Amino acid sequence: GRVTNQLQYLHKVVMKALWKHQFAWPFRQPVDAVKLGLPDYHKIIKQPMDMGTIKRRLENNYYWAASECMQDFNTMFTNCYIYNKPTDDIVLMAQTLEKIFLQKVASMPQEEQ
Amino acid sequence: VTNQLQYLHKVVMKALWKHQFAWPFRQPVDAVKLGLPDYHKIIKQPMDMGTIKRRLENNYYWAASECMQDFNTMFTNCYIYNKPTDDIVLMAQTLEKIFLQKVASMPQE
Numbered sequence A: 001g002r003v004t005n006q007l008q009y010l011h012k013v014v015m016k017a018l019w020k021h022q023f024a025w026p027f028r029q030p031v032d033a034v035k036l037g038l039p040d041y042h043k044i045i046k047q048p049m050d051m052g053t054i055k056r057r058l059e060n061n062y063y064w065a066a067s068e069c070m071q072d073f074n075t076m077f078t079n080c081y082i083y084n085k086p087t088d089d090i091v092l093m094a095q096t097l098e099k100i101f102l103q104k105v106a107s108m109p110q111e112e113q
Numbered sequence B: 001v002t003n004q005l006q007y008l009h010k011v012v013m014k015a016l017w018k019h020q021f022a023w024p025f026r027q028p029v030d031a032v033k034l035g036l037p038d039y040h041k042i043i044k045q046p047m048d049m050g051t052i053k054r055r056l057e058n059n060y061y062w063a064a065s066e067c068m069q070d071f072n073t074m075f076t077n078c079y080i081y082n083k084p085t086d087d088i089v090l091m092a093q094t095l096e097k098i099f100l101q102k103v104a105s106m107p108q109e
């Protein structure tokens, strides 16, 4: 991978803000389908993603560009919306976090180093 | 007329509006036409590219983030309402990947 201004911003500004959020706790580690008793989870969601995986990826220089990291954030939120019932609280929690994500992405340093 | 909103109009909406998977998203969901009587019960804030495009043309938005939330609502409505295996979900995912790719290069300020 490599280090850019944008990947540093996604790590220190965007992820830090989302991580600490009161609705973040279900998203900080992989969904544990066994523990939650969701035997269909991995049959419906083919690309699991979580902020713990994204954080580790930013720290281990896995990403080559900001867009790749932003795609992982998007997969995490989309997985939640696709799997869960529209009425589930987790959907409202994902939407709240996703709004912060987009607000902070709009303020990201424009040209990548 | 911010730098960011011009980018969202000329780069993002330009790319998404003409995409081969855009046609289901170009106008509001017609629940009667599509036979979806539960659509307006499940989706409380309908959104579509027609509406976003109109809003960009009519200088409705005060910030880029507001236009970005409308795009996000349109995609999220699709993931929440539809079955995981429905083609429309793949089409939404494809458009949204382009949305995020282009937003990654949007100017600051």
Ligand SMILES: COc1cccc(-c2ccc(=O)n(C)c2)c1
Residues within 6 Å of the ligand: A025, A026, A027, A031, A032, A036, A079, A080, A083, A084, A090
């Ligand atoms: C401790 O972690 C938890 C606890 C409870 C639920 C979830 C959970 C369920 C469904 C879902 O889509 N996500 C993203 C998280 C995660």
Ligand SMILES: COc1cccc(-c2ccc(=O)n(C)c2)c1
Residues within 6 Å of the ligand: B023, B024, B025, B029, B034, B077, B078, B081, B082, B088
């Ligand atoms: C002519 O317009 C069409 C045609 C077929 C499907 C949809 C459609 C269904 C469900 C849904 O969520 N969306 C966003 C679009 C729209």
